[PDB]
Design a protein around this motif. Sequence first.
Motif, PDB file in Angstrom:
ATOM      1  N   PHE C 242      25.630  22.620 -38.863  1.00  0.00           N
ATOM      2  CA  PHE C 242      26.873  21.962 -38.499  1.00  0.00           C
ATOM      3  C   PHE C 242      28.055  22.894 -38.621  1.00  0.00           C
ATOM      4  CE2 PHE C 242      28.462  21.377 -42.856  1.00  0.00           C
ATOM      5  CZ  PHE C 242      27.302  21.467 -43.608  1.00  0.00           C
ATOM      6  N   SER C 243      29.189  22.466 -38.065  1.00  0.00           N
ATOM      7  CA  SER C 243      30.469  23.176 -38.209  1.00  0.00           C
ATOM      8  C   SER C 243      31.319  22.446 -39.236  1.00  0.00           C
ATOM      9  CB  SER C 243      31.232  23.226 -36.874  1.00  0.00           C
ATOM     10  OG  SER C 243      30.435  23.788 -35.845  1.00  0.00           O
ATOM     11  N   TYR C 244      32.183  23.192 -39.922  1.00  0.00           N
ATOM     12  CA  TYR C 244      32.931  22.644 -41.052  1.00  0.00           C
ATOM     13  C   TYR C 244      34.330  23.262 -41.099  1.00  0.00           C
ATOM     14  CZ  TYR C 244      34.292  21.550 -45.869  1.00  0.00           C
ATOM     15  OH  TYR C 244      34.971  21.107 -46.985  1.00  0.00           O
ATOM     16  N   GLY C 245      35.327  22.456 -41.415  1.00  0.00           N
ATOM     17  CA  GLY C 245      36.687  22.955 -41.610  1.00  0.00           C
ATOM     18  C   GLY C 245      37.330  22.334 -42.832  1.00  0.00           C
ATOM     19  N   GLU C 246      38.237  23.067 -43.474  1.00  0.00           N
ATOM     20  CA  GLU C 246      39.017  22.500 -44.575  1.00  0.00           C
ATOM     21  C   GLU C 246      40.244  23.372 -44.769  1.00  0.00           C
ATOM     22  OE1 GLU C 246      37.402  24.760 -48.626  1.00  0.00           O
ATOM     23  OE2 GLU C 246      36.526  22.816 -48.162  1.00  0.00           O
ATOM     24  N   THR C 247      41.237  22.805 -45.452  1.00  0.00           N
ATOM     25  CA  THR C 247      42.387  23.557 -45.926  1.00  0.00           C
ATOM     26  C   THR C 247      42.367  23.547 -47.445  1.00  0.00           C
ATOM     27  OG1 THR C 247      43.713  22.975 -43.993  1.00  0.00           O
ATOM     28  CG2 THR C 247      44.920  23.688 -45.999  1.00  0.00           C
ATOM     29  N   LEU C 248      42.442  24.738 -48.024  1.00  0.00           N
ATOM     30  CA  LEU C 248      42.368  24.916 -49.460  1.00  0.00           C
ATOM     31  C   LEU C 248      43.772  25.198 -49.980  1.00  0.00           C
ATOM     32  CD1 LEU C 248      40.639  25.316 -52.037  1.00  0.00           C
ATOM     33  CD2 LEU C 248      40.223  27.661 -51.244  1.00  0.00           C
ATOM     34  N   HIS C 249      44.235  24.382 -50.925  1.00  0.00           N
ATOM     35  CA  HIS C 249      45.646  24.378 -51.329  1.00  0.00           C
ATOM     36  C   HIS C 249      45.948  25.047 -52.683  1.00  0.00           C
ATOM     37  CE1 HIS C 249      47.280  21.674 -48.218  1.00  0.00           C
ATOM     38  NE2 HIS C 249      46.051  21.194 -48.205  1.00  0.00           N
ATOM     39  N   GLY C 250      44.981  25.030 -53.587  1.00  0.00           N
ATOM     40  CA  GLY C 250      45.220  25.490 -54.940  1.00  0.00           C
ATOM     41  C   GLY C 250      44.265  24.779 -55.848  1.00  0.00           C
ATOM     42  N   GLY C 251      44.462  24.934 -57.151  1.00  0.00           N
ATOM     43  CA  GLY C 251      43.539  24.395 -58.108  1.00  0.00           C
ATOM     44  C   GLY C 251      44.158  23.206 -58.813  1.00  0.00           C
ATOM     45  N   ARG C 252      43.307  22.324 -59.308  1.00  0.00           N
ATOM     46  CA  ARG C 252      43.745  21.294 -60.234  1.00  0.00           C
ATOM     47  C   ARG C 252      42.918  21.364 -61.520  1.00  0.00           C
ATOM     48  NH1 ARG C 252      40.427  16.262 -59.378  1.00  0.00           N
ATOM     49  NH2 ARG C 252      39.062  16.683 -57.576  1.00  0.00           N
ATOM     50  N   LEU C 253      43.588  21.233 -62.653  1.00  0.00           N
ATOM     51  CA  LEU C 253      42.919  21.396 -63.926  1.00  0.00           C
ATOM     52  C   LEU C 253      42.067  20.176 -64.243  1.00  0.00           C
ATOM     53  CD1 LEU C 253      42.631  23.183 -66.430  1.00  0.00           C
ATOM     54  CD2 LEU C 253      44.509  21.847 -67.460  1.00  0.00           C
ATOM     55  N   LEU C 254      40.775  20.403 -64.465  1.00  0.00           N
ATOM     56  CA  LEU C 254      39.896  19.340 -64.970  1.00  0.00           C
ATOM     57  C   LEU C 254      39.930  19.316 -66.498  1.00  0.00           C
ATOM     58  CD1 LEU C 254      36.839  19.478 -62.545  1.00  0.00           C
ATOM     59  CD2 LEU C 254      38.986  18.176 -62.401  1.00  0.00           C
ATOM     60  N   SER C 255      39.779  20.483 -67.119  1.00  0.00           N
ATOM     61  CA  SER C 255      39.929  20.600 -68.563  1.00  0.00           C
ATOM     62  C   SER C 255      40.239  22.020 -68.991  1.00  0.00           C
ATOM     63  CB  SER C 255      38.673  20.165 -69.301  1.00  0.00           C
ATOM     64  OG  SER C 255      38.911  20.213 -70.712  1.00  0.00           O
TER      65      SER C 255
END
Lengths: 257, 257, 258, 258
Positions: C242-255
């Motif tokens: 398949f083909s896939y797209g996304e925009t990656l913005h930064g990180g969010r802290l889980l712990s």
Amino acid sequence: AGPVGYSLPLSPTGESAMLTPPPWHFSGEVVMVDYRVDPDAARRFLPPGLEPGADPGAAAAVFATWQWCSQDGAELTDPGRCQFGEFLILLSCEFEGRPMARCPYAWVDQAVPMMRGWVQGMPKQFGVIHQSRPVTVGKAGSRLAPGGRFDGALSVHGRRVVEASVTVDRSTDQPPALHDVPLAHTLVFPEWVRPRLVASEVSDVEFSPIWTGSGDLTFFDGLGDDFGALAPLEVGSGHVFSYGETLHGGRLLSDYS
Amino acid sequence: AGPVGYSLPLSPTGESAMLTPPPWHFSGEVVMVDYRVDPDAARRFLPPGLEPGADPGAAAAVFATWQWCSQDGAELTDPGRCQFGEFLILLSCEFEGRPMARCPYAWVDQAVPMMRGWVQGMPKQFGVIHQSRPVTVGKAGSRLAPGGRFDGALSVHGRRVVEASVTVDRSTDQPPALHDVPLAHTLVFPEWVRPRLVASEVSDVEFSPIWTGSGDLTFFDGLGDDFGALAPLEVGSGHVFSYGETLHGGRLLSDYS
Amino acid sequence: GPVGYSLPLSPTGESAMLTPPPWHFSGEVVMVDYRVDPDAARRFLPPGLEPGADPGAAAAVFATWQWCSQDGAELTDPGRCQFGEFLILLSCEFEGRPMARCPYAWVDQAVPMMRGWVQGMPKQFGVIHQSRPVTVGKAGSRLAPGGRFDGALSVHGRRVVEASVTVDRSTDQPPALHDVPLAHTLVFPEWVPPRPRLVASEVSDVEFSPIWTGSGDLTFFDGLGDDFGALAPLEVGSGHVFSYGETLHGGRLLSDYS
Amino acid sequence: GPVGYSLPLSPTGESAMLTPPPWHFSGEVVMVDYRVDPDAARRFLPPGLEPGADPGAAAAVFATWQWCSQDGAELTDPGRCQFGEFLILLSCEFEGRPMARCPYAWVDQAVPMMRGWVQGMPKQFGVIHQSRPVTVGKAGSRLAPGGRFDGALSVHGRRVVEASVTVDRSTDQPPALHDVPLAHTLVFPEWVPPRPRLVASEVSDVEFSPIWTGSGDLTFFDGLGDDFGALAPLEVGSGHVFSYGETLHGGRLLSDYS
């Protein structure tokens, strides 16, 4: 008796040969730009037997990426073995009144295709070749649609040779002329211890719809004045399309004897 | 008339040719392991005219890195253009009572040397080739001295083909026998639309002192049973040395006619 | 003094190897679902990441990508905006929510490799090959029933993974492990004489093409050590192309484990 | 949970891309001293790093290396322990003591690249070629008067630097900029929404071969931006060809700006 093979290296069963005998199948993606060349410069690259094209100034710069295989399809299961990238120049010419294309320069980025090129008389050298791919999801690229931009680049020995760009504005069912005629090569190999003009015989030629628009082409110095003589005087339309063919062998055009 | 050149691509002045005419000079660094091969397997790789060596089971696995240039030295100023790595197998043979070496398999990692190989009948293919270098300062390597270890490795299509190691224990002035005899190649190129046995003629052959010790050699599967037939039955001495020669052209051993 | 989103610093900031996010991605994927030893998988999960509702679910993922920054500038130089990738995904959860852990990844370009470490994604360098669909001629497979697609990874001149998929139908069901947040460990080696953080990559505009699904085949090879080998398949499941797209913005802290 | 000196983490720590220091290096160097615009150089110096006693002194450095960890294990696989490098050095001082600042570096292997960033050394990826001395035959130069040695760096398929040295004598005087501490900026991009540190690489067992010195030639090309271009030579000085070794142990803090 002794070791055998379609090509070097020879071996007792013939399995070791670098090349497989033809026919070979090709399926590729092309980014091409039509351009205008100095017709007098182009003429110097045509060997006896090949006359200037009906439009002597018509040329093309062609980027492509390919998959290929032998009749048994065996190479397809190992993508690293069956893929290569290419850039070539095409010049318009004729043999006995019939339109053909002369390829004075080509580069590829894999060794099997390079050697196989010399088998055909196609003057392949090695280079680093990049080419845009269409996307169908996301934003990081262009679609095959009006406004879509596609680029190609060739570097050799760590410096740029050609950059090309196409921004497409419509689809057609008209294959670019220089990509739809026989290629006439010179079969010759250096003497270690008799050139022939040959045409590559192909069948099952197939084009997708052709996406056409503006073309841009930049040639750089480095490769010598002979190559630079073929740089564009003016740049024409660009074309983006898929192409397939089966390559069978050579047909002698002239022995010169 | 028309375009010219020592090799493809042809061009009006001949400057574009991928290859320069000989002679070519070579200066390299070698890591070599002598080994024992199945003599009956080796015989199958010898074409008519070449007889089994005086010691039919003597073989060698040879890693080298090279600089090369034409008579004018022009390539030396661009290190990327004048360097390449190589691995080859040598088998002992004779032509009319005279010791020679047959090279049934070779790999290099640059395109010019590869093609130039086929010009000579040397069956070069493309691979990824690594080789230890001696050091003279610091701790991150081995000196050319007793106890010094040197390794070589060849991978093709992303899998291992050969690994070799040498741990040297003394210096001598005796060149390894298979690296000090003419190479007998088969000059043949695939027909597109008459093999000859040739010797490479060399002059100004030069060896540094030879560092010799234990040898180790491992062959891997992947390349086919024909190649595997040449794997070592037993492994002998390893040698590390520098080598130079000038290569002039081919000498016909047999036309078979 | 000199500035920049990343090294090298420079007077105007223009020399930085990495651009600030967001970054857009458009890729072609060949993926195989498989069953991993759940105990082996658990040992790769850091504190806070718990075994998946299906502890044994894993995937082997080949992809080829184009990427660019918000201004799209990289797109005009194909050599700058393209890379290949292979990664392993393991099913896990954080605070009750399904996620994926990537214990190993390889790429074939330096910018993506460093950018991975910025995110806590454990990218190393490799040689990665992947079949492409064809639409003309005979030298390849169509994205159609019976089409076969292959992937291979070699590292240091030795095979690591081979995968193959022969598709038999199209669906609108994205593969589960490719449709959850990735939970990485953001940590860099101490140079001046710890402090790992569990972080999720924040994405938007996730898009899938139709998913071509069929049989899967996967082979792991030795060489990378017993640790990697422990994630070899016990059984191999379905493959997907398949083909896939996304925009990656930064990180969010889980712990941050404080 | 999984551990390791660096990513990828693993149950035993064996998968880590990087090994802990110390690391040993043995290299062959082709270097050209040159004069840089002092104002341009100053703009690449972060707070705490002041202009050199000779503000305009710079160097262009080509090297090829072997390296290994304390156990020497990498040495047995030449592909794993070798890399090429090009770097720029600028003269500076910290608290009155001469040092060198490396504003730009390129390497051709991933392990050395990442390990550079661990240290604050701004390594990017490039294609780097360098002449080697020969001792037999005619295809090269000897390390002797009249011997010429060349270096070239291309990035993204375009030339960046060419250098050449023709040596005329041997000395026991190591080139000044190659015999002082390197002061780097250790900083990583913020992924979860600063804190750069000025650090020096701590080395021991520094060794030089005899230094072959002669004329130098250096050409910079455009493409990498006006920032890099600002460090192009105003004048080119002496070239040097030599072997070099050191052991790199870790970092020492020069300032954390607190």
